């Protein structure tokens, strides 16, 4: 042994185990099960002549990421310290960060950073910023959060590979710019409680805001919604409008129901339509415009109500099988479901199959007006003069859910609910349609132009409560002032592509804040999924999540003014979400209310909402191993997660396995989907959109290997029973 | 004995005498027919109480088995046949109504527009029944009856009802394009055109035969779209395809400027994700009106050779590879220059550069040739400027290589499409072409769909039968009636998109071409190969475009020149007879036979009504209507067999009895040089340009394979006598 190793500045001095042995008990400070001895037994049959000091770091970094495990889940802490501190070197040359105002400067004349920042905040301002900041609190992420930020988050050079910052100046600046544009007065005071609460991980943000605010970029648009009219004018102003935001990398919802059928006669009978298939190619084409072959890049859902002529050619877009004629494979889709289908489906009566341009004010009212439908759809099927189709309820939903079985991507969205159970007045501005992943339920107008001010783009801000961060509930309050008016000052801070879509911005200010760590925060509780046993806490939890969401926005609106389509809400006419509700919750649930909603709905009905919506359910698998969370509500598959990487294989475990390791229900563990979407539906009684609710299925726990088809009709009716809005992935394990 | 059923649900005993009179009446004038040979094949598939009209269909049919070489009048009998059917169907009877009772009728029924009842009186409807000869419906081939019945007679699409004969599309075409000019000779020029359509002496196209009396103004069917390099201009193209092939036309794509994968955006914000991407995206507005997403319209799409992903884009046609590098349900048209041949020559290799890292370079190979040598060769002595390098070998052959196998990939001489060209490439130069590559247009890319900055090149079509008259001279009047035609619809249809109307009121560009060129060719005892027709053409297209521009000249004295004349090099006083490829004055020697010098100096002060006015287009649909050969091309045999719904349809060559060793059919001749001569003479005096096809037959050549060495000779020898464009490569199975 006694071999060289290499320094930094290209010197060279003999090895000295004593220096690495002084690093590793600096990074396994309050760690259990922990072992420095074997970790140097890993790193030094590693070691060789000449070796760069900069390799040793990284050498004991993986030797401690492979000691990941649920016998000793603190290593993930180890291999995580040890990584923040190799950071440090490559940011700063030194372990602790410079000055908060030296370091903004010198990133801003790099052109990294806003020059804004200096604008908005003097230097004295930055010191007072800097004493906020605990650097310490680097050594509370995990290995699997490190790889995250160093990857995505924390601003650095993507040719050279060099890191220009660390993560808590990612988190005092995103606060800095947010609330930029406060008064002196209550500006900092702002910040500081903005900062811890990102900084301990109690508001979840999301990527395109961790990695942007605060850079040049004014790009955080990740959720857009496009209506599609039934003409030439309006598909060429939808496809141009979904290659604006794809290049922005956002997610589209494309609502393209309204396009007529096959056949269908157009200005008389001067021509004839060609279907709406050769028009849902031009849409995919528009999608993966900017996308490196055509499979990447960006995605879309759309959708198109299940009563429509071609619905027995539009669900089966996604199979394998047939020609590419006949087939759209690289987008998602979304049937649209009401109560009128389901009855036909009960009563295994028929479903009559109509083109949206034959039938007068159908297609309006399968909306808005559940009653003015089913008069409508009775009348237009006694019609002879009505170009229709027949065909049995029992066969298109078992078309529907086979494939969905099979491909996994064909969504349900249940609109009546999404408006009997809206914050939206269907008469003045109905949701006809969903995102990407299914959470998002806002207010669309088509558009007859690229540029046309009188169409309206639906776009949301999202964000999540980290349940698995707080004591109790009451801190929410806290939480959602921060929350939502941080998200409300981004609405006016970033920047707008398209006309049609700042419209529906800054006329409803819509957001969109969920959860994290559902999973965990059932375990500390202890309670379960399928058993039901969480249905009360859940109810009065997301209950506290509402009520001061609704609170915060509310005296939002006292301070800087209601939004200016506040009047298009079920909220104006005080009419809240305990109010529209699902009933058959009644039956599930028994939990209080514990908050004074008829104080909050009187002063709702005075001063109004800043935002039109504040909570909806999205799925988060990155922002979530930032805290450590489980993805969004959805349970772990598994106690380790396994994902390969640059850097090796990089291992993520459930937080608090060690006292917990039984507490947790895992995905294959559960008998059914009963259990779970009952949660989902006492969810929904409270979220102002929808809920990203995925249905899983297991092969082996069915006999001959496969699931029935009755099954599948029994649960999508379940869900349908509690009010749930939208079905997102059909998770089949293999 | 047996009976028939007829038409009012009445019952007759069968009448051998009434159809054997039908058969004699359809006869007349007719050589080496049988009509007993007619009844014999059809009386035998009589039945008892068969409908009179499934009798008249079994005797049209029975006609049309016979019509073969040894008696090709046949074409005639079983078309006055199914002529008389159609007078049934439309009238009830054979002698057609009064032109005024007819007009009225149509109106009211909403199939005619009703401004033909407004701008001509019931007086003046008399005077233009008088001008129509119903006897001309005879002179129809049963092939051009069946193109008649099938697309262009106004009809019911759902019932099936034929609403009108030949004669009465023919009379209001003319009536409704001559409808604005003065009473002092409105009725003159309507008869002249009549006389000209009806005669078989002007083609016009579909769109106009089958739409210039109806309510509707969509006509035109040649669109020109160039793109820019811009997310705004990619999105206003994609808008612009859509609205046009939802109208039934051709698109020809400039995305060249397009620039290529990886390419820095913003200072490199992001980078580019490719031009494949972008190109699916046009394929999909193309196939966005089409059924099932296979027919409907089809376009071509055009890129400079010298561009980067040129490796990329020669291979989207064929049917390997993954589908995330294809895009096969397009054409395309690769576009060269003198520079590129040059590397060719010497062996050397080919730079490949991104139209965003180039500066000027893009322009320069449309416009200045000169200037362009100058900046490639120091962009290639220039290492911070990304390239790669390619054999000039390699390339060509990769290029023909897609070429004979897909036989869609296509080639654009550039250089010889700007230096022999009607407009100034400093001011418009010609960027692109159209599908079938005979259009030479200016285009300006838009910034949106709605864009009053942009260009969008429009073109009127239309042909003069080369089999139907008897001298070249006859052209003066016919070249007067088709331009005076075309300039008059230009103000007639409507234009949906306002960058499409700019440049179709600007130039007033119009395209005329030829059909019968090979029925012509045997009339005067010439061949394509052998070059014996070389000075015949030289003073046979001379005729065209001087008749041609002297009525568009004389066109402009009186309600003067185009608005957008003073970009044209005729502007300057520059003829077609001044910038042609001097290699032509090689292989012909005839002299000018027109007074020419007398043209230039009217041009120069009085101008030109259309920027352009000559293009050799393909024609296959509207050859058939006058029994003429499919433009310039050489029939590929005697007879054509083209299966239908009704039967197989057979058209034989016009004058077979006389002509039969005087033809030269498409796979009789040894090689592409006599064809691709010819073609480079008519070039001299075309306008825009012509759809030449390459042909090769794989027996002529050892093992079966045509070697690369011949498509590459070939495609030099095109480019030697300046041969503009090339269109498909037909290679014989
Ligand atoms: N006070 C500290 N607490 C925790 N980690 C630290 C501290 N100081 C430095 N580090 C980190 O420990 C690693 C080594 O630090 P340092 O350069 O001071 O010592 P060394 O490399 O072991 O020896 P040498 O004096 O030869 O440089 C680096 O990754 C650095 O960021
Ligand atoms: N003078 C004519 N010259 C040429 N064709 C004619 C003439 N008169 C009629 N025809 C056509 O010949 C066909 C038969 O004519 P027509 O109806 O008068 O006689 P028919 O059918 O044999 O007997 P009928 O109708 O009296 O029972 C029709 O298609 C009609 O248009
Ligand atoms: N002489 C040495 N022998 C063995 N390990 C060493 C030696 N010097 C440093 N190390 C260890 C300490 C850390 O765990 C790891 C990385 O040290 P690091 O401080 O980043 O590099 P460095 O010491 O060469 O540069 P610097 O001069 O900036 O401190 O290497
Ligand atoms: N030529 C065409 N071929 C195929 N589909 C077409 C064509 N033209 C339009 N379409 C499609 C696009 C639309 O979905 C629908 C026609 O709608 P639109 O663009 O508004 O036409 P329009 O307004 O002129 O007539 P209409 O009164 O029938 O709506 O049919
Ligand atoms: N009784 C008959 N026996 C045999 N052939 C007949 C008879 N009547 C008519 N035809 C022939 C004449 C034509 O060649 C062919 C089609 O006749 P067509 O004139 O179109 O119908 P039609 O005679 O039944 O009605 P219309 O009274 O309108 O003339 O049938
Ligand atoms: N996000 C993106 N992903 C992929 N391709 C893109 C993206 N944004 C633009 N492109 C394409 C479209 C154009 O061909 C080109 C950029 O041109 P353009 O839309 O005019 O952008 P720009 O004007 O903002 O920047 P530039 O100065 O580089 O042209 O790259
Ligand atoms: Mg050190
Ligand atoms: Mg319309
Ligand atoms: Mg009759
Ligand atoms: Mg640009």
């Known amino acids: 042994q006694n071999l060289l190793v290499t320094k930094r500045d290209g010197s060279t001095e003999r090895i000295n185990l004593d220096k690495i042995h002084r690093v590793l008990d600096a990074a396994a400070e309050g760690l259990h099960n922990v072992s420095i001895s074997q970790v140097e037994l890993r790193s030094h049959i590693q070691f060789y002549d000449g070796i760069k000091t900069s390799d040793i770091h990284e050498t004991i970094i993986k030797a401690a990421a492979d000691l990941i495990s649920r016998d000793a889940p603190d290593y993930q802490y180890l291999a995580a310290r040890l990584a923040i501190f190799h950071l440090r070197k490559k940011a700063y040359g030194q372990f602790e960060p410079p000055a908060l105002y030296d370091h903004v400067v010198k990133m801003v004349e790099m052109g990294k950073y806003d020059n804004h920042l200096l604008e908005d905040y003097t230097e004295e301002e930055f010191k007072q910023m800097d004493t906020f900041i605990d650097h310490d609190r680097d050594m509370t992420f995990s290995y699997a959060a490190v790889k995250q930020l160093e990857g995505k988050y924390l601003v650095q050079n993507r040719v050279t590979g060099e890191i220009y910052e660390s993560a808590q100046f990612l988190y005092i600046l995103v606060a800095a710019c947010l609330f930029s544009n406060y008064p002196r007065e209550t500006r900092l005071q702002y910040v500081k409680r903005f900062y811890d609460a990102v900084s301990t991980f109690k508001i979840s943000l999301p990527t395109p805001i961790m990695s942007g605010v605060r850079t040049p970029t004014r790009q955080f648009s990740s959720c857009v919604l496009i209506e599609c009219g039934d003409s030439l ?28 059928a096959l056949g269908s006669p157009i200005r008389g009978g001067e021509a004839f339509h060609t279907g709406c298939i050769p028009f849902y190619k031009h849409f995919q084409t528009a999608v993966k415009s900017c996308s490196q072959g055509g499979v990447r890049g960006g995605a879309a859902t759309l959708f198109y ?57 159908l297609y309006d009212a399968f909306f808005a007006d559940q009653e003015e439908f089913e008069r409508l759809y009775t009348k237009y099927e006694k019609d002879d003069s009505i170009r229709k189709q027949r065909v049995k309820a029992v066969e298109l939903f078992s078309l529907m859910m086979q494939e969905r079985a099979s491909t996994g991507r064909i969504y349900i969205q249940n609109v009546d609910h999404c408006n009997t159970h809206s914050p939206f007045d269907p008469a003045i501005a109905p949701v006809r349609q969903s995102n990407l992943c299914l959470e998002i339920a806002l207010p669309t107008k088509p558009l007859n132009d690229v540029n046309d001010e009188n169409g309206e783009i639906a776009l949301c801000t999202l964000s999540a409560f980290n349940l698995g961060a707080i004591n109790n509930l009451d801190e929410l309050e806290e939480l959602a002032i921060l929350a939502v008016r941080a998200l409300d000052a981004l609405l006016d801070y970033q920047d707008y592509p398209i006309p049609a879509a700042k419209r529906g911005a800054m006329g409803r200010r819509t957001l969109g804040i969920g959860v994290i760590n559902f999973a965990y925060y059932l375990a500390k509780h202890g309670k379960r999924y399928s058993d039901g046993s969480a249905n009360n806490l859940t109810h009065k939890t997301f209950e506290a999540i509402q009520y001061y969401l609704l609170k915060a926005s509310n005296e939002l609106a006292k301070e800087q003014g209601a939004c200016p389509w506040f009047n298009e809400t ?44 504040l909570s909806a359910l999205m799925p988060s698998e990155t922002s979530s191993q930032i805290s450590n969370a489980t993805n969004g509500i959805e349970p772990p598959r598994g ?6 990487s640059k850097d090796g294989i990089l291992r993520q475990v459930v937080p608090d396995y060690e006292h917990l390791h039984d507490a947790y229900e895992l995905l294959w563990e559960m ?31 069915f006999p001959s290997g496969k699931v029935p088809m009755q099954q599948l009709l029994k649960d999508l009716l379940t869900a349908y029973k509690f009010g749930v809005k939208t079905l997102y992935y059909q998770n089949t394990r293999d």
């Open 305 to 361: 109500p299940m009563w429509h002529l071609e619905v027995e050619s539009l669900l089966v877009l996604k199979n394998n099988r047939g020609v590419e004629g006949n087939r759209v494979r690289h987008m998602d889709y979304g049937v649209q479901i009401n109560k009128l289908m389901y009855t036909r489906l009960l009563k295994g009566e028929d479903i009559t199959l109509f083109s949206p341009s034959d039938v007068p004010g």
């Open 639 to 644: 106690y380790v997660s396994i994902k390969a």
């Open 233 to 260: 004018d309006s598909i060429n102003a939808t496809s141009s409008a979904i290659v604006k935001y794809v290049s922005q990398r956002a997610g589209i919802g494309i609502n393209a129901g309204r396009i007529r």
């Open 570 to 613: 079920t909220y104006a006419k005080g009419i809240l979400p305990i109010d529209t509700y699902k009933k058959d919750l009644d039956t599930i649930a028994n939990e209080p209310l514990h908050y004074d909603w008829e104080a909050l709905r009187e002063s709702i009905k005075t001063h109004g909402l800043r935002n039109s919506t």
């Open 671 to 701: 008998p059914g989907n009963d259990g779970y979407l009952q949660l989902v539906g006492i969810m929904q009684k409270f979220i102002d959109q929808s809920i990203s609710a995925n249905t899983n299925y297991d092969p082996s726990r």
